[PDB]
Symmetry: D2
Subunit: 283 residues, 4 copies
Amino acid sequence: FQQGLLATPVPAHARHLFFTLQSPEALPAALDALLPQVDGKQLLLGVGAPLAKALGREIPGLRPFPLLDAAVENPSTQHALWLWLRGDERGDLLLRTQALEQALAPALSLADSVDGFLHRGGYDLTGYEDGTENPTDEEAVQAAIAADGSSFAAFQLWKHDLQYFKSLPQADQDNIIGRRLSDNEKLDDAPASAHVKRTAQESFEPEAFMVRRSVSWADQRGAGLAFVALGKSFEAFEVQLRRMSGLEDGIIDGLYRFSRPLTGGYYWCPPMSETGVDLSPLL
Amino acid sequence: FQQGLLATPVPAHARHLFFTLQSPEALPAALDALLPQVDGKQLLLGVGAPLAKALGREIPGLRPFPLLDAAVENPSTQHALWLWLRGDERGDLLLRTQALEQALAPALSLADSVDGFLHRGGYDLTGYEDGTENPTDEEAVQAAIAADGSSFAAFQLWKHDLQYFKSLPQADQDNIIGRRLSDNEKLDDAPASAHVKRTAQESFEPEAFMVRRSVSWADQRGAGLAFVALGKSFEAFEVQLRRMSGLEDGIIDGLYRFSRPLTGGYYWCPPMSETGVDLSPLL
Amino acid sequence: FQQGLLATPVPAHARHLFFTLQSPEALPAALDALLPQVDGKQLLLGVGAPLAKALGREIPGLRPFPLLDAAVENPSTQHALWLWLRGDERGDLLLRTQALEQALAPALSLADSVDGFLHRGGYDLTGYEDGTENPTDEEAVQAAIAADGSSFAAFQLWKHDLQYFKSLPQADQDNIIGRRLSDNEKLDDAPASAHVKRTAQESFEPEAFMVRRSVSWADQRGAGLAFVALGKSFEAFEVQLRRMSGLEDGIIDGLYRFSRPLTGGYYWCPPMSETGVDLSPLL
Amino acid sequence: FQQGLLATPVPAHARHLFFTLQSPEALPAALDALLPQVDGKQLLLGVGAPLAKALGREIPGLRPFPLLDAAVENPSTQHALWLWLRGDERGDLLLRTQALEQALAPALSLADSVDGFLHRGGYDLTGYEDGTENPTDEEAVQAAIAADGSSFAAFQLWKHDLQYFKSLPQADQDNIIGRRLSDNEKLDDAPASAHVKRTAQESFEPEAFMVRRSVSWADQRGAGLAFVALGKSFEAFEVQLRRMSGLEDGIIDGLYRFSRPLTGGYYWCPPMSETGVDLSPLL
Ligand code: HEM
Ligand code: HEM
Ligand code: HEM
Ligand code: HEM
């Protein structure tokens, strides 16, 4: 089985941590201290491509975050290790992060972190509902979980310009998203650049279905959406990001008019075994 | 012809600005206010790959910062426009940044900025001399300036861990860089991982000579080196970075033990016409 | 008559906003848009001493945060207006801050804000339960609410050093607080510097009882406690603060070993009428 | 005998450090590492009132930064120790800051830091010349240095609103400062609220002369003026600050329209001996 990547009572808070491998000499000491804490429910783990190449192994399906030569900027800030903390107590995530940061401190240094929260029941700070057309029970498992229970997650930290977006007329805001804010109805007559029209999961030659487990965030860098896209492989995420960037037809997604990603990373989520997390292909 | 990006009377302070193209409709209005201010001496301009693709043009040799599938992390955060301010008055550069930011307001939003300074007469906060094996005048013009007067500049914001690096014995510090700090003399018996052994400009299939116009920086993100590599094209910088990343010999550069890059970008510096900067291949 | 300063089921999140009066000419336009939003439950209001001086009025019992010439540092950063936002959704409070800053735009500018949350059910990030010896029910109206529904609130933003505190032995942590962490029982044999020994509400003349409604916080300034002390006037808070600073017996509270306040302010919470909040003593 | 607080060629860069006394037991070991480095030229020393109270000593003339019950906000953020770094190399001050906090670490913790610079030859970021009517030559020693080598310095970190100030008509800007920007001539017909009208050194009951050694600053907190007022006592600064706040006549200084202080502190600068700094009244 995988990790608790699909539990439908999604916690009110999240904490994403990203680590750089600085000293591979003390890496075994850090992993022996880390793996017994990964239960897949409150602490989830993803392995990056630099961590695979550092250990000489190559996990099937894993590769760095792609480089898209487009008119919009999708930065590739690939890290070695990704920790995903989920809980209802915002203080509990903070206290463990200080424990985890000290736990891996010889081998891994903290490169970036995001204090996430679930706005209302699941919304982006812009007011639009996030997760409407997300698949549900078992439809998630076909889309997000691989044959062996591993999953492949794409991470992007999007920074919103909430002041500029909320200053536009509602009719123009709706043409940017592709759905009406008042009742969450798809705008059939929206421009081709509308977000829902760009990412229509049924509008690809494989039904590029993914599971989105994003949360909202806010700190000194501003505020936006911590986008997390799970897939049985990275192709569902990548073909959509290429269409959003105008690399398929020349039409760029409307989200880039008010929001831009600061971070980009691909991570392999190993399966959950009976002794713990299954990092056997990597050790 | 060329810009004054090589004048060895180097100013004491620098400011690097990076912009994202958010509304291409107002782009001509922004270019009209910017180009008359770019004299190549106190204000330099660099065009990014997304800016060319946004205009449907194709500059030969221009492409985004590469994506290296290596054991160390070299991020690619390519932006549309790069502005390089150089001056002796740190406050003057600050006031000009707010002026530039308002003049490009609707079309380009400020994505990243770096407050740089020339440490001592040219050293890295670690104390080592920076620019020792840099080519000099006339010897530079063939190595750093392209055939048509334009240059291809690579930018990386490196973040030092001065506390850890300066906590190591003086012998280990010298083996990481490859030179003795006391007199800046190459250690021929250093390990193959030494930075100077990795970056020996004569040990490539062309003598990959570049011009390094780097400055030190310090703000809330920490402190380090704002690396700037000029070249007649990007091959010199790329073959160097691949060897440092262990993509050529499997030996990783020792810089990654204490320093890591946060950003990465390729930029095309257009030649100076006599109207000003020559953006003819872009119109 | 009072605001909802005493409701026991404390919401999971809070936001404290502090404003400086920049343009008193636009104050009438700002107050008419702000006062109908103060219900005392989800938005609470406190008036600072500078706001009284700006209107030439004199509120009985109101004054700036005191100046303690002590061996410890208690800052006095008194502001004009204090807005206290309470809610269960961390995202809603953030969006209302952007709404509140604009409605008060020309007259009042944001001087400081705090993103607060109730750790567990009411605990300090150090793990100790906060609010054990708070008064119960009507005893809080006797101690925190003045004659006319109004209250006098003291605000301090304390910054913890959780790394240092958690490294001490458990008995040293217990001797600093004055309670044992394992069962939350008072250490009668604790040193005179233990926090509970310093602020024992019955050990003063007269009995300095207050109601504390503090929440935990964490951002780029660190993490700590947003201390809020409610009293029928400021004498209870001040006499306790003076004993903690050693101005009564020479013994400094043990909290200053790992925590220090960053801000300090006295505010007058006006009574709640059936038309709204009563600013008649201020017009 | 005095420190170099009056040298006319003021260095291009400054760095102000402020420390909180956390463990007074390790204070001797910290002072033993600090006093041999205080030469009064590149590293200057100011002692705060809390440091005197912690040692049970009492310096004549020293007291905490006052608390002014006015309509404007002047914070009192007194600290135990003030270190003033001056130099022409911005990077040298950065490295000494890490070295200093390392040496004073167990006893004193860093409470605040400012990265200052001298804009032009002595201007405020608004463009007005700063330091015109500072006394010169022999007149500074009678105004800034007491009967012994000691001076008494007041520090305030003012945060400017450069965007708002430069949007005002030039005559409104001139009426706020009280001097014309075109030639730096006093406007005798300016309103009584003009800054130069409030602080006219010869319009007090003694000719309240002080020596101002302020620099400009700019970081994440914004930008403004790091105000440093030197006097043989705090009486010159205090009576002026009280007039600017409208506590003497009711007229508030025009600086508060666009600028506000973030910090406030009084510091005693000990006399300089030929063995070091003389802290004998402190032992
Ligand atoms: C700031 C960034 C983003 C925001 C605010 C955002 C928000 C939304 C919203 C409001 C919807 C409509 C409601 C729903 O169907 O869930 C939606 C749909 C969707 N989004 Fe985005 N999203 C963002 C980034 C992305 C990215 C980077 C991708 C993929 C690379 C993506 C993929 C999708 C998909 C597949 C749908 C399904 C809609 C459908 O098929 O009907 N989103 N998003
Ligand atoms: C933390 C980042 C860096 C530090 C601290 C650093 C510092 C140094 C130092 C001290 C030297 C020896 C003296 C000198 O040439 O100035 C050197 C050599 C050199 N470095 Fe770097 N550098 C950094 C990044 C880079 C990168 C990323 C590249 C190329 C991709 C580069 C290219 C070179 C070259 C071409 C030399 C020539 C040395 C020779 O040919 O003997 N530098 N570096
Ligand atoms: C970082 C700052 C502070 C922390 C972490 C803290 C924490 C605590 C804790 C854990 C207790 C024991 C449990 C309880 O009675 O709630 C306590 C007691 C108390 N504290 Fe604090 N406190 C802080 C600041 C203050 C300040 C500044 C004051 C007053 C000026 C204060 C007033 C009190 C009072 C009145 C009690 C009553 C305890 C008794 O009567 O037994 N607290 N505090
Ligand atoms: C953001 C804060 C401040 C700014 C931008 C500022 C700027 C100026 C300027 C441009 C002048 C005219 C030329 C000069 O004397 O330098 C001046 C005059 C003066 N300033 Fe300020 N000042 C500030 C704060 C203060 C404060 C708080 C005090 C005293 C408590 C003070 C003391 C004085 C005095 C005594 C003069 C007399 C000059 C004369 O009589 O010719 N300054 N100020």
